[PDB]
Write a protein that binds this ligand. Structure first.
Ligand SMILES: O=C(O)[C@H](O)[C@@H](O)[C@H](O)[C@H](O)COP(=O)(O)O
Ligand SMILES: O=C(O)[C@H](O)[C@@H](O)[C@H](O)[C@H](O)COP(=O)(O)O
Lengths: 468, 468
């Protein structure tokens, strides 16, 4: 009888099935369109692996060891609820459903209560790493039933990416906390990509770097503190030549960014809970503005973007190194926002999130993977209740040393009309959060003036209304 | 019998009752606690007006002319639905309920459906102007039943603020469109207040203006193109002396901004629909960051904000005039965002909003009222298909002449570490919306690299996936 089952056999589910099989576990798979089941078994025997395929969910469930465990890798929608409903007709007390898709956390909360009515345990698990990580080692973010986690943790530990001896998996917490952490991972991923792209236009249009010089700089950055998956693939992307023309492939790609929800969800949560995530908004702003390609073209035909002619007396020596420090400084600031969001939500939901553990399993497998995440992990291992990431002693020193470079980059970009919303939003966020006194005193005065909303004073307690 | 009735006698409801009476209409009022109903009648006596009070809602409904019209000014919550149901137990076919509170538009849609099942017409009406506007003239944003609007239009026209002889009321559209327009008014208002507060901190910390000079500058600006309620009251606020100390009152106000939902709702709507509103995020970011007053104090103690020492050879000539032009430029950009939001939402909701009419009724009564809004109303009445506000010929000229001032302001603020998120977000929004090519090509290549999401090409049709 099978150790675990998996429903949903796109390339993601196929690769995870091969991953589980290659680790010595016997796995049964199902997919309504049977050719995907056939493709999985074909790929398994081509790699000398064993994957059992069944034509129905009933036959798959019947071949599962007790306690029965099934992984769901189905595109988000009513097809997930239809499969859960069908599974609950054959599962019994103590069996486990594991949803591995990018889900909105409120949806998983509903499915947890529904399965619990039949005493079926539910694990809502975020997965990061794509098709490659699904096959060779990804980052698992399971949350929900701790009992469910314990029954499957050996599979997750062996199939996840390994950072030294440490598997990239942890018990996130109860309920839908696993979906929430994976959502925030993608939100942070949105920010890193927007910051990298802004570094790309800064060197292209201020330093006049061609695509070959750009790829070299990113590869040089990947050898240092900025070592990361996104910096690495960016260096590869910028050097890629087109095979339909004689241009660079990145110059032939239409600048309309897609998006599938997780970035928007992070933003909705930050707005609703009053948690400031300015770098998040900048990344979303860029993607949402890019959609209106025809309007942007007509708008530029009225507001012509003149070609950037650099002042010959412009001090641009060490500017490339200033940009390195600024981009690193912005990652500290951006991750501070994301980790602050996770901390406040954990406190509001009583999830008891372990931010050091979350940072640890983000060191490999996932998209934001970087040696940067090992520094974050160490910061929270030393202070589990750290309020803001850059208040850690080491990160604080990094900020104090690299912030002048950030100001220099924002200055030059502003002077030459280069849009850098994520860079400037990150600098603004740091300056406001480190300001004991902000101009919201005037805002409060205005609100009392036109709305009689009252205000508080600095020198005494109470709520005061003034006849201005 | 009474021409109309009003339920809910806080200061807003009391003043509107006096307003309706002062315009010649016979109005009956009711409040759950009878103490407020008496107070309304005493104040009516003292102002040589007559307002009829009733002890229960049944007597009020019995004294209404057909078609019966009742105005609701109840604090948002279940009490609104409770009063609606209580009213539906006595209204007949063709009677009208008008809700005037700051309501979330989805909740009004529900109340419109229920009242329509009882054949009672519903009017969800946004109201802006505060206590003074309720008494002497506010901006009414009624949406829903066109039959209900036509039956109550003369009361709304005479009680609204008058710009010349044009009353600040219009039929917004069907459904809850009136609540949505009022919500976006507050969103724009949030942006105006944040931009003004950044002008204040720029002059205070870069130019070293004290409060007397600050008040003089805003008064000076109120005489020119920036003539507006918010600029005017800002001048009064900055000059206001505290009577408990010998300091300026605004300096004794704790910098923790309140917020009661409408600004947050505007951002939630923009985020969910993918409509870029970066200036709204900056306004909300500033208010949300201000709440963390204790963390901000601890943060500055570690990140000491040095005294802003201005370079003696810094060219600050015409800097005050650059700030004037920059603030006016940001208002153009911010209203471009908010009016684009209204346009896109009108399309998606099939509301057929008249942006020229909405701008017209925002010229008086409401908080954002300004001669600026007459220019906006004229721009849309000249071209009802205008897409972006700053694409109007005269607004386009303003951007071209004033955008260099905005760059100069952002440059100086960046150099001297002044957080100005709304100014920088406005400038970034303009530079992105007017960019034919944005670095989202790199983002699209990354998403195809790690997620196989495919990309589009600039030179041919189709969706392409590259083995990078
Ligand atoms: O962690 C990952 O492996 C990716 O982030 C994964 O979740 C997927 O690629 C998302 O769809 C990307 O997000 P967008 O499609 O919204 O850019
Ligand atoms: O248009 C108006 O007359 C005001 O905007 C009114 O709606 C009220 O004063 C809001 O409560 C202000 O908004 P906040 O309280 O969220 O700042």
């Amino acid at each position: 009888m099978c150790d675990i089952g998996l429903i949903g056999l796109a390339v993601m589910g196929q690769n995870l099935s091969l991953n589980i099989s290659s680790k010595g576990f016997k796995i049964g798979v199902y997919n309504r369109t049977y050719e995907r089941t056939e493709e999985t078994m074909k790929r398994a025997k081509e790699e000398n692996l064993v994957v059992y395929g069944y034509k129905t969910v009933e036959e798959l469930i019947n071949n599962l060891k007790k306690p029965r465990k099934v992984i769901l890798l189905i595109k988000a929608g009513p097809a997930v609820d239809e499969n859960i409903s069908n599974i609950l007709k054959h599962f019994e007390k103590g069996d486990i459903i594991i949803d591995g898709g990018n889900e909105w956390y409120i949806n998983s909360e509903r499915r947890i209560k529904l399965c619990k009515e039949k005493d079926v345990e539910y694990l809502a698990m975020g997965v990061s790493g794509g098709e490659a990580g699904a096959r060779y080692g990804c980052s698992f973010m399971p949350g929900g039933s701790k009992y469910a986690y314990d029954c499957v943790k050996e599979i997750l530990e062996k199939c996840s990416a390994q950072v030294g001896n440490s598997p990239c998996v942890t018990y996130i917490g109860p309920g839908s906390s696993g979906n929430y952490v994976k959502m925030v991972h993608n939100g942070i991923e949105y920010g890193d990509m927007q910051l990298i792209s802004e570094s790309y236009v800064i060197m292209k249009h201020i330093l006049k770097y061609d695509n070959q010089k750009l790829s070299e700089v990113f590869n040089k950055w990947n050898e240092g503190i900025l070592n990361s998956y996104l910096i690495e693939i960016t260096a590869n992307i910028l050097a890629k030549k087109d095979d339909l023309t004689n241009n660079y492939l990145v110059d032939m790609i239409l600048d309309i960014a897609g998006a599938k929800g997780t970035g928007k969800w992070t933003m909705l949560e930050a707005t609703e809970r009053g948690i400031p995530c300015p770098t998040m908004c900048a990344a979303l702003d860029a993607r949402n503005i890019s959609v209106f390609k025809e309007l942007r073209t007509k708008a530029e035909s009225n507001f012509n973007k003149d070609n950037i002619l650099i002042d010959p007396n412009e001090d641009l020596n060490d500017f490339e190194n200033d940009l390195l420090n600024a981009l690193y400084c912005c990652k500290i600031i951006s991750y501070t926002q994301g980790l602050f969001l996770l901390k406040q939500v954990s406190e509001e939901m009583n999830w008891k999130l372990n931010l050091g553990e979350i940072a640890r399993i983000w060191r490999g497998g996932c998209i934001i993977r970087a040696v940067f995440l090992d520094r974050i992990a160490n910061a929270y291992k030393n202070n589990e209740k750290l309020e803001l990431l850059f208040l850690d002693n080491e990160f604080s020193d990094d900020i104090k040393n690299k912030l002048p470079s950030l100001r220099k980059i924002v200055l030059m970009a502003t002077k030459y009309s280069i849009p850098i919303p994520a860079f400037s939003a990150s600098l603004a966020y740091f300056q406001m959060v480190t300001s004991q006194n902000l101009p919201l005193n005037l805002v409060q005065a205005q609100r009392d003036y036109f709305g009689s909303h009252t205000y508080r004073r600095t020198d005494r307690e109470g709520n005061y209304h003034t006849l201005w």
